[PDB]
Amino acid sequence: SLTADQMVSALLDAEPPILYSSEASMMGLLTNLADRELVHMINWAKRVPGFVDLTLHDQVHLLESAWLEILMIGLVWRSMEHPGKLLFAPNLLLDVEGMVEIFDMLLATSSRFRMMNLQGEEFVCLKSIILLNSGHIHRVLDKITDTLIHLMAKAGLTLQQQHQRLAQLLLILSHIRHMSNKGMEHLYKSKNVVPLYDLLLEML
Amino acid sequence: LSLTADQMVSALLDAEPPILYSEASMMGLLTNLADRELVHMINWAKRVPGFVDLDQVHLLESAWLEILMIGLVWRSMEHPGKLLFAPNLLLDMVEIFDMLLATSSRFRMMNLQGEEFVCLKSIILLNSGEEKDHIHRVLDKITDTLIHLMAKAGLTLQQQHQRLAQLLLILSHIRHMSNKGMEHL
Numbered sequence: 001s002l003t004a005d006q007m008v009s010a011l012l013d014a015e016p017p018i019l020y021s022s023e024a025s026m027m028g029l030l031t032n033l034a035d036r037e038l039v040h041m042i043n044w045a046k047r048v049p050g051f052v053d054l055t056l057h058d059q060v061h062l063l064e065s066a067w068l069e070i071l072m073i074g075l076v077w078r079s080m081e082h083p084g085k086l087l088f089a090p091n092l093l094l095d096v097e098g099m100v101e102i103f104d105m106l107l108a109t110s111s112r113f114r115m116m117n118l119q120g121e122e123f124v125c126l127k128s129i130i131l132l133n134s135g136h137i138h139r140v141l142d143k144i145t146d147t148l149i150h151l152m153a154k155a156g157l158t159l160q161q162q163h164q165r166l167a168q169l170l171l172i173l174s175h176i177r178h179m180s181n182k183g184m185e186h187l188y189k190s191k192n193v194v195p196l197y198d199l200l201l202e203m204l
Numbered sequence: 205l206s207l208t209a210d211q212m213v214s215a216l217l218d219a220e221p222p223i224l225y226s227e228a229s230m231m232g233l234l235t236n237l238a239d240r241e242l243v244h245m246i247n248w249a250k251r252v253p254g255f256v257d258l259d260q261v262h263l264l265e266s267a268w269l270e271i272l273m274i275g276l277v278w279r280s281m282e283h284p285g286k287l288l289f290a291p292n293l294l295l296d297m298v299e300i301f302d303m304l305l306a307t308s309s310r311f312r313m314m315n316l317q318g319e320e321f322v323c324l325k326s327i328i329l330l331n332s333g334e335e336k337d338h339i340h341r342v343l344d345k346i347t348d349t350l351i352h353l354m355a356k357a358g359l360t361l362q363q364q365h366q367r368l369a370q371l372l373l374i375l376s377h378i379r380h381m382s383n384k385g386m387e388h389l
């Protein structure tokens with residue numbers, strides 16, 4: 001029911017904080033950083049319009065299917081004004097076997113956003129898209145498109161420039177889904193970061 | 205890049221490969237089918253306005269299973285519960301099979317037109333990966349094509365953007381389907 005300006009302001013208020021923090025040392029840091037970031041992500045997801053109307057079962061499913069893409073799109077957004085480096089935290093700016101191909105993708109994605117001049121208002125829309133897309137849900141997904149296109153028209157882009165930019169923005173998401181799949185394959189061995197159902201249920 | 209929307213949709217519709225035919229028996233039949241489908245794909249790709257002007261090898265290395273999946277998902281559309289691999293090969297790993305039925309159900313639920321299906325395939329192929337901007341400008345042209353095809357259909361500007369968004373968010377699903385399809389292979 002929210003207006004496109006009311007929506008973008010709710011997403012901007014929903015925004016999580018920026019957190020702080022050898023192969024095993026670096027991994028112990030990344031594992032711990034994401035763990036604490038997961039708790040702030042569950043609070044954020046409930047601040048996203050429409051997600052809290054959903055049954056706990058649906059909320060779980062979406063988060064389990066999107067917790068790494070959400071972490072990565074947040075990462076790629078922070079790291080953006082730091083070319084050649086990945087700002088996992090303000091005290092954790094980096095540049096481990098197998099992890100090299102994934103790091104290089106996350107660098108390329110960050111480099112794409114910057115060249116494309118990604119804005120914070122479009123970013124909060126995209127991260128909200130990923131949460132709701134991972135799995136009424138299509139009614140909300142339509143509302144975030146209307147918000148993105150409203151922000152493109154408010155910025156002065158022509159109707160052509162609007163649908164062209166929307167598409168480029170929605171295709172970089174195929175890459176984020178890919179970066180997530182390869183990451184899930186790499187990390188898993190066992191899991192040290194608490195399954196999100198235990199967390200979501202623990203928080204209510 | 206000089207090409208119009210109707211010139212782009214018809215150029216791709218012309219490039220459309222033919223429909224082909226057919227446990228160890230099922231996988232062997234599928235390996236053989238796919239192996240014959242890659243030769244038609246490799247040739248279709250050369251007919252994608254922009255693609256032959258390249259790097260082409262890696263784009264088919266990334267999109268070969270996404271293209272095989274979108275094709276399968278497009279064929280099997282009026283066959284709910286079953287997957288139409290070939291007219292003589294209709295089957296009804298289970299995870300990948302279910303993920304493929306859901307996509308086809310979404311394709312049915314959206315009334316996805318063939319003219320829009322060719323555009324998705326060409327976007328899949330190009331977005332799978334001065335020479336780098338060539339891919340960008342072509343994708344921005346397939347998007348004008350998709351929006352024009354919608355304009356013709358009678359949809360409003362708001363009903364156009366939503367539908368563009370709807371179809372594009374399905375490519376994240378087919379990227380995911382391919383990735384988990386690769387692990388299984």
Ligand SMILES: CC(F)(F)c1cc(F)ccc1-c1sc2cc(O)ccc2c1Oc1ccc(/C=C/C(=O)O)cc1
Binds near residue numbers: 074
């Ligand atoms: C290259 C790389 F580091 F980005 C990268 C490469 C991969 F293969 C996979 C993930 C990544 C990322 S993106 C990211 C964003 C952030 O805000 C914070 C942490 C991380 C993180 O690292 C992680 C993420 C999760 C875990 C969990 C382990 C467990 O359950 O035991 C460990 C390390």
Ligand SMILES: CC(F)(F)c1cc(F)ccc1-c1sc2cc(O)ccc2c1Oc1ccc(/C=C/C(=O)O)cc1
Binds near residue numbers: 241389
């Ligand atoms: C369930 C399933 F069959 F869909 C499926 C599950 C997966 F995990 C991965 C892919 C699939 C698909 S999608 C498809 C579409 C088509 O038009 C035709 C064949 C196939 C095919 O099967 C394949 C694809 C490639 C190979 C290669 C083997 C080799 O190099 O030895 C074997 C079987």
